[PDB]
């Protein structure tokens, strides 16, 4: 009918409008415009199972004269996701001498995470918990088996001779009380706390996300 022709006309105007918007965006991109990613970020697009860590060690030793200090992690557990064998066989004990590790375990993967970081060579010394929040100011309660889950846990190991002028003591807090944003996006307060712990250091981030690229962090991820 003529109504289908009118729908064709409407989709023609919509195509022209969105074509103009696309041309505007691609003309602005090929000009002076920067994204939300900082200029000092180091993103690496590689799967950890296939990534050659020796090249990373050589580059870090060449261009910094030392090694990493924080190896913050957030592994995709099986419960794309990968098995715990690959996470345990990763070369973390070769990526650090004197530093910390942040693992961001879940409730179903708590004891195995503790065993993993004790097998890498670290000693469990601290724990950081993220208590979720609502817009009104209450706790965003969820669900679970025995109790309603409204928390997220980060397990912290230590290694080597940490006590120097590099790392600082008695800083920040274990509890991050902040709203849940994104799909699975940890708050920026953990990055602020890390920068309070080791100011002007070298950091590594495994299983990193485009939403959490930072101006002092080497970040490895697959969608990065």
């Amino acid at each position: 009918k003529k109504g289908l022709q009118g729908l064709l006309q409407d989709i023609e105007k919509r195509i022209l409008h969105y074509k103009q918007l696309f041309f505007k965006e691609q003309n602005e991109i090929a000009n002076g415009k920067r994204s939300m990613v900082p200029d000092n970020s180091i993103p690496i697009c590689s799967d950890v199972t296939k990534l050659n860590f020796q090249a990373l060690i050589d580059a870090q030793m060449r261009h910094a004269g030392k090694m990493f200090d924080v190896i913050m992690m957030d592994p995709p557990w099986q419960l794309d996701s990968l098995s715990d064998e690959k996470i345990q066989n990763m070369p973390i004990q070769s990526l650090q001498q004197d530093g910390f590790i942040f693992v961001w375990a879940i409730n179903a993967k708590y004891r195995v995470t503790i065993k993993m970081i004790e097998n890498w060579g670290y000693k469990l010394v601290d724990e950081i918990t993220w208590v979720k929040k609502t817009v009104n100011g209450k706790i965003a309660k969820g669900h679970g088996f025995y109790l309603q889950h409204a928390k997220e846990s980060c397990l912290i190991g230590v290694k080597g001779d940490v006590d120097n002028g590099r790392f600082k003591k008695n800083i920040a807090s274990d509890v991050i009380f902040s709203e849940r944003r994104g799909q699975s996006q940890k708050p920026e307060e953990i990055y602020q706390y890390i920068n309070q712990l080791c100011p002007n250091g070298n950091y590594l981030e495994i299983f990193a996300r485009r939403n959490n690229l930072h101006d002092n962090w080497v970040s490895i991820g697959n969608e990065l």
Partner: protein
């Protein structure tokens, strides 16, 4: 002595990051992050499109997709970028035409100059 993280980041990005994440000097490629994953127009893709326009005609971007880019590309994006690098919103008058590189640049500049005094250039695009 302390180190500066600008040169350190550029040096790390030179040998660790991919060719699309950083430039030749080591500076961050913001165009890669301003789009989604996978939908990024590479400088190799632009040269591939121009070489396909050199070889085959305009408006028959099926063989161009088949044996130019990867065997699989976006037919819509090929048309949009061909319109953008010709300076003209709609390429109806260019259908079936095979244009060289120099003549392509001349046609683009001629369209830009034609629309400059016609009050038509909206973000380097001529409307008709």
């Amino acid at each position: 002595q302390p180190l500066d993280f600008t040169q350190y980041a550029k040096n790390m990005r030179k040998d660790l990051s991919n060719q699309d994440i950083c430039l030749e000097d080591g500076a961050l490629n913001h165009s890669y992050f301003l789009t989604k994953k996978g939908q990024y127009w590479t400088p190799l893709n632009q040269k591939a499109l121009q070489r396909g326009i050199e070889l085959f005609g305009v408006g028959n971007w099926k063989e161009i997709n088949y044996d130019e880019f990867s065997g699989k590309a976006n037919i819509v994006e090929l048309e949009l970028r061909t319109c953008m690098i010709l300076g003209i919103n709609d390429i109806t008058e260019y259908y079936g035409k095979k244009i060289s590189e120099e003549e392509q640049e001349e046609i683009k500049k001629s369209n830009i100059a034609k629309g400059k005094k016609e009050n038509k250039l909206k973000d380097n695009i001529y409307q008709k």
